[PDB]
Amino acid sequence: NHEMKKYTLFPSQFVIAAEHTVQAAYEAQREFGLDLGSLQFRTLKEYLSHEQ
C-alpha cells in the first residue's frame, strides 16, 4: 500500500531606493561624461543580490 503527506512555503519582501538632483546630474554629465541614473540603478540592483 501507500501513504501521503503535505508541506507548505511562503515568501518575503524587500525594497531599496536612491536620490539625486537635477543640477548634479547635469554637472556630472558635462564633466566625465557620466550618467547618474544608470550608475544608481546598477548599484541598487547589485546590492540587492549581495544582501540576499
Binding site: 500500500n1 501507500h2 501513504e3 501521503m4 503535505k6
Partner: protein, 31 residues
C-alpha cells in the same frame, strides 16, 4: 488512512467562478 481507499488521498480546492459587483443606476429624468 491508506491509499487503497477513497479517504487515503487528500483533496485540492478549485477556483470555479467569481461574482462581481452589480450595476448601479436609477431613472428619474422624466421629471
Amino acid at each position: 488512512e491508506m491509499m487503497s481507499v477513497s479517504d487515503g488521498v487528500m483533496r485540492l480546492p478549485l477556483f470555479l467562478a467569481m461574482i462581481l459587483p452589480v450595476q448601479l443606476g436609477a431613472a428619474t429624468a422624466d421629471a
